[model samples]
Each structure stands twice: as C-alpha cells, then as structure tokens.
Target: SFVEMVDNLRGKSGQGYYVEMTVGSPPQTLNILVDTGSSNFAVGAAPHPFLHRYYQRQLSSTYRDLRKGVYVPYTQGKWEGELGTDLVSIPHGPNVTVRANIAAITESDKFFINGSNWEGILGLAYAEIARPDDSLEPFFDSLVKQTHVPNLFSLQLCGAGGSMIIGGIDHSLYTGSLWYTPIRREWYYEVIIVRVEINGQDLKMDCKEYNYDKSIVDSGTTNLRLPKKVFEAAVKSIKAASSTEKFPDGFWLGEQLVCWQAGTTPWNIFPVISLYLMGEVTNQSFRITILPQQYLRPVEDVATSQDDCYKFAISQSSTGTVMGAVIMEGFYVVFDRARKRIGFAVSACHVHDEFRTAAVEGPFVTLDMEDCGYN
Candidate 1:
C-alpha cells in the first residue's frame, strides 16, 4: 500500500525531520527521526528520562526477544540494546503490519538523541548497513515485500513541515525533469560526484578518484560536510567573492566557520555552488545546486559577539562529503532501491493538489521511464 508520513522539522537550523509511527500490539506511537545515513531501528528505553517515551517490551504480547545483543555506534555516540521484533504499522495509508527487528536500547553513551523531540531513529538505508547483522532488512524493505507498495520512497523537506512519500513519487512536488544517478554503493546512498563548480568555475580535482571524492546523500546530518582540503578551497573561494570575515581564532573548535556581516544579503553577496554527478554510463549528468541563501545562514556567535553575522553551513570532515538536509531542502529526492538509483529535481516546496498518494496492491512498477542513456 502507498503511504505518506508527515514529518516536522526540528533542532537547530531545522536539521532533524521526524515522523510518527506505531509499534507493538497495543500500538505505542513513536516519533522517529527519518534517517538515510545508517540502518539501525532502535528506540530508547530506561536510564534516560529525557527520551520522553520509550518502548515497553512487557506491555506488548507480540514482542519477542531474539536473545541477541545489539550495539550501534554513530559519529557522536553509541547505543546498546536487545534485539527483538514486533508489529510495526503506519497510521495513515496502509493498514498492513510488518514484524521488523528493532533494538530496545537499554544503555546509551552521549547519544544526545534524548534532547531531540524524537524518541527513536528509523533508518531507511539499505540492509547492508544494518547492525546486528547485514541479513536483517530495514522496516521499509519488509513493508514492500509484505505489502503492495514499490521499493521506493521520496523526501520533501520544507523546514516548516514536509511530507515523506512511500512506494512512489509525488510528481507535483518537483519541477522540471527528474535527474537520476546510480548509487555507487548500497551503504549510505553513496554516489559519484563528477565535479564541483562554484559560480560556474569548475574546481580542479580528479573526479575519477573514487575513494577520495565519493559522497553520501544523508538526511540525518544537518550541514554539508566535505574533505578538509575541499572545504578549505571552497570556503576560500566563497570568502573571496563575498568579502566575508573569518572568526578571530580562524576556526570554530578547529573547524572553519566563515561569518559575514548581518546587513549583507546572501544571494547578492555569495556565488552559487553546484555539484554534478556522473550518470551510470551516460554523459547526461545530474546536478544539485546550492544557492547563496542555503549555504550562508544567519547565526549568533558568542566569541565574536556577532549576533549580526551569518555563518557558512559547510564543514570539514574526514568522512568525505555528506550532502545533508541543508542542500536537500531545495529538492525533491527519490530513493529507488529497485533500480539502485537516486533521483533529484527542483522542489516546489508546498505540494500541489494534483499530487495524490497512490496505493499499491502487489509488485509495483517503477515510474522512472525517462532514460538518460544510462546502462
């Protein structure tokens, strides 16, 4: 069945997007963070009073303990729990339920997740990234196999609140033709970034160096993360164009966070940054453009006493480039697992009335008919 989950933008800079769902036999409603970076469906349990709500295994008769311990480590923290399965269902579209493996976190270390409005994380990445074992499939994958929906989903992030379309794409959410690019790996929605262009000038870099330049389209992350060298070069160019002032210490905890005057208009001061991705086998490329307003956002800094300064949202990372929600908010994103590809198009933000959710009964056919000459 085709389903749509309404998600609210939360956290500083509207980074985290969460959706509501029910778990267990009596139906315990949960607000879960929709993440594409990792695969680990877990909910917080006792020990953290700030979690708001947690999974109660004793309350659900259908809950079965798999006796396996689950441990998941993230960039910031770690989670340890007991592996188990229970009935999971969506409230809106499909009434069908699926028994999916989930972690009932008993202990957490610096997860920082408790402070958020969300109770747990619903990982949508491929099964290969799932913890405990790669053999375990994600909730959506099981939903597609048991229900009538396609093995696809779409994200529309508007900052106020957005919609997550499952099983199909809402055509009215995006403008122009959808550009497609093949996933370089099953983990993290990895893709090949052919080149980076700032203000129409291509940066001198070897795009063919797969290990050095591959990027992940991650919704779980807030800011755009790139390699240190790339971040420095990109920021330098942006600084030159905008005449922005750097922090007094030259970095924010050793990470460059460029700031400019409050009176400066981002669109008028900064240049557009565009990312071009190589098509599977076609010369036709897929491009993601970052306008000045997206990269440069108003921020308050205590060190500089600059409440009137704007900060560049890009950061340096050791894990390569992560195209986060900051850049993704401007486009409608489609995750087509069946085709092993991801599609993007300029978003219309608010949905049009013509965009209706379609219900699927069996094996649903993919709607990507346009071929960009890709193998």
Candidate 2:
C-alpha cells in the first residue's frame, strides 16, 4: 500500500530535490545541490581565465558557450541554457531510477555561484524554466503522478546520514505524530505558526502584520532564519541563559564566550526552550554558544556600518541569522504543496538517546510535526 501511495503522489510534472549524479558519465557526474526554493537547474561555467582553478578539474565535460539557449533570470543574475535530460538512480530504498533535466548555460554572470563545493542547484519552485505553460512539472513530479499515491512526503534529516526520499513515507521516521497545515502560495510550503518558549516565558511576538516568507523553508539551507525583531528577542532570550562572545576574524576570546558572560552572571538560569506549532508543544533545552568580543564594534561603526561587522565577524552580513538544521533534525516537517501548509513532527533524529535526555536538556528545541494536523 505504501509503495503504491509513493508512486501516486508524484505529480505529472513538478519540482523536488535531485541528488547529483556523481557516479555517472562525463558532463553528468557533477556534484549538485538540489533545492526547492528557486526554479532552474544551473552549473558553473567550465573555466574562465579568472574563474577558480579547482572548478575546471571537477567537471569532465567540455564547456559549451550558452549564448543561444533559453534565458532565465534571478535576484542575483541571469542564465541562458538548453535542456539536457538523463536518468538518475536513488541511493537507497527501491533503488529506482528517475529522469532529470540539466540546464546547459554558457554565459553566466555568477549570480548563483557556490565556489566548488557544489556544482549547481536544482530549483523546486512551482514553475519550470522556459516553458510558461507548465507549472510544477518535472521528472520526479511525473514519477509520483504516474504512481498515483496519496498526498504524503516525509523528510528525515540528521547530521550523521542525511538523505531525501520520494514515492512513499517511512514508518520509522517518527513514532509520535505529524503536524499538517494547508499549503500557501508563491515559493515555499509554509506552516501557519511557530511559537517558541524560553525560561518559562511564552516568546510570542506580534506576528499579525508579518507575512512569513515561505522561500526559506528549503532543505538546502542548513539554518533556520527568523525576521529582524524576532531575531533580537530570540538572541536576548538565549543570552539570558548562557555566556557568549562577539569575535572579529577568529575565536580570539580563549574559546570561551567572553562577551555575554556578564549578562548571565548568576548562572542559575536554567534555559528552557520550547516550540509550539499546529497544537503540540515541544519542550527542549540547549546551552548557549556566544560570539566573540572583538566583533562588537564601536558606537560609531555600529550606527554607520550597514553590515553587522560584530555579529557575523566571519561573513560581515549584519542582516543574516540562522535557524539551521540543528533545530529541525528530529522533527518530520512536511511541505504540503496541495494545501499550501507545512507540517512538523516532534521527535529527535538521534534514535539511540533516551527520551529523558532531551527532556532535561534545555536551551532550544524544535517540534516539527508534533502539532501538524495532517498525517
């Protein structure tokens, strides 16, 4: 029954993740990052005089000039390419093979460059490139649609051995329950609300005016990002629990957080953090890791510099914050495209740890599907 459900749920043609065909033939065996946030599959141009040298060695295909292919633009830049299709084999489960489309573009202006770590990105947006008539139509979509299964897809992410699946859901993924929501429009499959609690206080912000940006719920992103004010409150709550520092170029603060130590001087504050979504409440805990002291700029730079030179001493981007996979590991989050909602399950991905270990460990914990109504 589950196998049939997997096949049926695939759309006639749509978007989803695509594991890179690293073991395949020339031009195809490139390491790629699959994403659902944007629509378009792209790879770095072979080699330019100024391009990174390592990039040339990684790709086996001769670079093709993509001046005549279809043109697709992004917030960062534009790409022109023709379509290339091939079969891909899954790493586990049924060992099934699926077809994938590769974008062959030549004249890329580096709008979406990933160094050499990842070759390209597979866009999972609702639309396909060039073909305006098609929406959410692709190889994986076609597979699920041809199978004719129920509306069910599950993502089990763990640092040890993270992978994505298609066709059906896994029973062992979670033992508790699934939090389901109606899907929203535009880019992401969104959840209605995510309520957080820390130190016995319900950390509820006025989110009525806030239209949650659904684009960031991507599996590709390792961190979870919150808005500006929300980010401030969250960091404050975290700082209240433990010591942290603000560094400039390196961890010069003796490995210990030298800055926020004064904030939590008493050290008696037990950091209790919780996340509520749908209807379930997840009570979890964590220890705070502070940034360095050098990162904290003088009053003049603080007000004048647009970048948060102190916070992300490493990157220099002040507006950037993350709610990474560390929070979502145990929970089963569902991206309900049909209803435009996201669901979460409350559980930890580490199967060996005793349940009580998480109960008493306080700092920050996330509940994926603990409250999502959909199963």
Candidate 3:
C-alpha cells in the first residue's frame, strides 16, 4: 500500500486537525495544521507571540530559499511570507521524504490562533489556488506526484477529535458506500449543493439560494457558513420546527451566548440540519445531516466556571456556504480529487450514546438543470 497513515491527528473542534511533521535533514518536528481550504503549505518562520517554537530555516541542512514573497488571504485570516523548499517528512506518515515548497510565514494577522498548539499549516488542496501562482505545487500534489500513492484521502472528525488517512480510504472507519458529489471547482474543494432542509422540510427558498455564490467543503473552517439570506431562512425554519419557546433574535443571530445549567440537556430542542448535495452518480442527490450536538457545540474558549455555554456553529457568510467542522464532524469524508469528486459516509467514531446524529443518505431526485455552482 502506498498509503501514508498519520493517525494521531491532533486538534479540538475550534482548531483544525493537525499532525506532527519534520522539516529539514535534522528533522525539526512542528505541528502542522491540516487544511483543505487553501493551497499553500506555510509555517511560522520567525518568533511570534502565539507560537511555542518557530521553524529555524537558518539551521536546516537542506533548505533552499526561493526568495520570492507569498501571500494568502483566508476567509478569516491572512499571512505574508517568503517561499522556500525543504526536505519535509512526517513521523508515522509516508516513508518517502519530499522536498516540498514551504511558505515561511514571517508576518501574519491572527492566522496563528491563540490556545492552538499547531505551529504551521499543511495545505492539501489543488494548485489552482496555490500561493504566488499555479506553478507552485502543494504539499499533497508533490507527495502524490513523487510517489506511487493513489490520488485519494479520507477524513473522520469526531465530537472532540479526528483522524486523516492520506492516499487511500480507511474502510473500517466508515460504514456503507461513500455518497459522492462532484467538485464544482478544485480551487477550494468547492461543491454544488442543491437544497437545504430542516427536519425533512425544505428551507422554503429557491435552489440558487442554497448555493447563493458558491458552496465548499473545507476542513480548516470552524463552522458551517451560509449565505446571508440562507442563514436568515435557516434560523427562521429552525425556530419554527425545533422549539416552541422563542429564543432571542440575538442568540439566533450569534450575538448572544446561550448557556445550559448543570444537568440541563439543551440539545433536546433542535432539529436536524440537512444539506442536499448533487451526487457523483449521475443526476441523483445525497444529503448530509447534522444534529444540535454539532451546531450547538460547546464553546471551550469561553470563560465560564459553572455552566456549559455553546455558540451557534452555523454563521452568516457573504462568500457562500462553507461546510466546515460543524457539518464535517459527523461523517467520514473522502476527497477523491483525482476523479473530481468528494464522498461522504457514516463515520464509526461519531456514534454518541450509540446514536449517530450525523448521516449521509440519498439517491434522491436532483434538480440538475439549475446551475448550482458559482462561476
């Protein structure tokens, strides 16, 4: 098997999944955040207030500085750095060491998050959005091209933890067949979602509203981001179907924090959120569902002593729906980029109290005539 297993993927829900990888000949191990949204592999090159240890490019035995500047502006944060190439190796990962492009970030604004132990980012996306230009190859692209590994990778994010398998799918980690959807574009693992439903009811909006501008599946994103109108409609629909008591508008809008007292199970009051994706099998459709445990995920960063406070994981976005950890945490996701598709299956790790709240079910009819993708 040409598969690389990086099983002890570390990171909580707030921070993205990361794995320890060594750079340079002496093998300087740094925790690199695994992100599928971007196409640049970046690491902290200089000492910053947040990082515990930065990459010392000066000491690396096999480091080649490209001297060219690189910049990447994310949905949340941005970083500016200089490009270089170095021998990168992952512990308990691929056996072959790759001479990979490294964006040694010297300057960044809030990209290096507080409370996160990961020091760098490993971009597993395509070169279409590669920093500095498409000519530069991403870490995974280099990994696959230089090796015999198949062009496939799978991810499983649980309630508080997760794992990622590169080059192949871990069949044991998931159940049933992987329901796949075509990638709208490889720039950001983009997808075209056909519909949105709350407890099996329509979102009461046009199909275009479900996509608005675009829809993407990104592991780096912390929450499920919906377009403004879709957000509003979703909130309204959730309120109507989930509970009888009206929650404050501010709470639904994510302005006020909602806390549950000790012994109170607040998760009982929410409806299932479903996203209908255009399936990989012809014009059929498949849906991925999430319960309150996901969207109402407890906020660990909040300074609270007695009560467990949670924030709405679904947020408003102008840049379309970003299906992040909130939705991804429940299913075993396979990014089969070689076939230009993404797959979702039931994860074995997410069975809470023997009940799996997240699911992928379909072969339902699809409105294929409409252009769900954003050009």
Candidate 4:
C-alpha cells in the first residue's frame, strides 16, 4: 500500500502514526495510518475514482459508507464520510475472534491516503469529531476495555515488510539481543538517548544531548524519520558501502538529499546505530536498509529552498520527521509501565510459520494485560 502520514497521540516533535485494518467478511488486509490524534478508521470507498477496484469490491460487505453521515477534519486535510464501520474479525491478538468497526473514507488521489498501495487508516486515537462523551473512545481503547484487558498495549516495528500485531507480544519479534531503556511517563512514551551508532561505528551523534523526543516511538507511523542532518549521515553511510549505483524510491532531495537502499548485508555490518538510554547503549548496531530503490533520488544540482529536505517529498503534519510504522515492524516491542522499560523481542511472524498460517490453521496469540506488565 502507499504510505500515509498519521499524527501521534503523544504530541511529540518527531512522532507520526501507523495504520492497518481488515476489510470484508473473510477479511482482506490493508495497512494504513493508525492515528491517536484523531478518531475513526476511514478508507477510500467504492464510488471513488482513484481507489483500487478489488478493494472497492471488498468494500461491499466489509465497510459501511459514511459519506452520508460523519465528517472528520485533520490538520493536513479533511475527510467527509464515505466512511463505514463493521464488525472486523482479527485472526490474531488478545481477543481471539472479535468483531470491531472499520471505516472507509474518500481521500485525495495522492499516495498518502489514496492509491493502490494501502487499504486505509484504522484510527485508534481520541477524536475531537466524536461526540463529547465519545471523545475518548480510541479504537484500541474499546478493544482493551471491552476485552477487559489492561489499557496497556505494545508495538514491535522491526523493519520493512513486517506485520503489526495488536494485543500480545509475538515472541519472534525480538532479535534475542536487546538493549533495555526506561520509558518516561508522558503523553507518548519518551526515552532518553545516550548515543546513536550505525553498523559498528558511532556516527559521533550524541543521543544524550538529543533531548528525549516523545515522537520517536509510535504505532501509527510506518517508517522512522530522522532530522535532516541525521538522515544525511545515515544515507552517506549506506552509500559508502555500495558503488555509485542508486535506487529511485530510496532518496529525495529538497532542502537536502536523503537516500536509502536495501542490499545483502548483516544487520550490523556497517557502523552500529545504537541509541543509549540512561547511559547505556540500548540498541547495538542495526543496519537500516535503504528504502526500496524506487524512493531514492540523486543529489540535486541546486538545493531545494525548503526548510527540511525530507518534507519536500513526504508531506509532514504537525509531527516532526513523521516516523511511519514501517521502522518498528519486526521487533516484539514491550511497553511496560510497571518496570518503566520498553523491551524488545523478535516478532512471531518473522520467526515462526505458525503465525502467518494462523488464519488457516486456527489459533493465534492475542495480547492481554496478563501478557503486558500486570504479571
């Protein structure tokens, strides 16, 4: 699916949102922005011209067209109905076989909200548009409350091409080697940074001085976005390993040039990109693959006049760098309020065929408070 930007619920500088949903009775899968800043999950509907016809066909029984009723306004744009809600069946998670509401909305033909890339957004955040009494009804909140699980939830965005599991932590999400860090009590979970290393080499960037931005970790965003300087350094490191060859979808040049490429390399072959928390490197050197070749762009002859280069290509809302959900896909992320630490594990989907085959074979892991920190 195409990438879309989502606002983070915590109101941090660099945070964004991640989105994903199931459509239809047997349910077709779609990944979108999971916005905590707003309420409601809306996707492009049947009558829309730019929407994928297969999705439109799936929309028949899957969603309720909200075009006739609701209206939601966001900082970047406004969605006026064509929205739909129905009992969605999540094959895996805390609630084994649960039914929940899903939405479908009309969006601009741009890749963010529209296009053949993604299904639509499943908003899990509080909404100003919802009635006063309904304002706090975040989608996940309902799931947790209704399921009677603690209000706790966790996400493990391992890397590209990984799935987002709701409720429980899939054991496979971890790399088995975790660097622990403490999470601060705030709107969004914030952590202190000691340093950042790429591959094994420290980039000389200090995460200590880099004030803990609450925006870094979010379930809503699909990718991790860094400041212009950080992004440039990352790209330069990646490029240094390869010849002059470039990928199209990997780089964008606006105020600056940002590049990423995926090649066969160990997760820590390059400099170790480590983020230290409380004076320790929580994450060892992990290789961040270049974005798919299609997203790359060469350095511009004349630098674009934008304030930030990455924003020129990917639209930015109130959030900083707009870290999409893609970056956190594979890890089994633990958001433990009790211990005040965020732990990591390999995601089940990546490790075991059991997870991917769950829908057919039956029985999948569901996340509940007992699974979170209540234990």
Which digits, one per residue and each the tens of the lDDT, describe model 1 over residues 1-375?
232443433443333787777889899988777789888888876657677788898999899998999898976678899988999976753568898888898998877454677778888998888897788878888899888888898887763267678878878777776777888778779886766778778776655431254578888887788877777778777777766533543543234444446644335556778777655553546556677656554454657554355556777877778888777776788998889998888777632222221110111122221221112
RMSD for all candidates, in order, please: 7.1, 10.6, 2.0, 11.8
Best by TM-score: 3
What is the per-residue lDDT of model 2 for residues 26-107, given as tens digits with 9 covering 90 to 100? 4245444555545665555455432342123234343333233556665345656555544443333234544454465556
| Tens digits of lDDT, candidate 4, 220-272 | 54345565555667667655754355434334332445323323222222222
Model 3, runs deviating above 4 Å: 1-6, 301-304, 351-356
Winner by lDDT between candidate 3 and candidate 1:
3
Candidate 1: list runs displaced more than 4 Å: 1-15, 208-213, 244-266, 297-310, 350-375
Per-model C-alpha lDDT, please?
0.70, 0.41, 0.82, 0.41
Task: Write model 3 residue lDDT over 1-375, tens digit each, in one string.
Answer: 423463558786677788889998788989999888888999999999999998899899899999799999998789999999999987866677888999999999979988699999988888998988999999999988888777878888876657788778888788877898888777889888888888778876778887878888888988889999999888877787657665677777666767767657545568888888898666689888888788876765366467877777888999988888768887889999889999999888774632436778988987562576655
TM-score of each: 0.84, 0.57, 0.94, 0.53
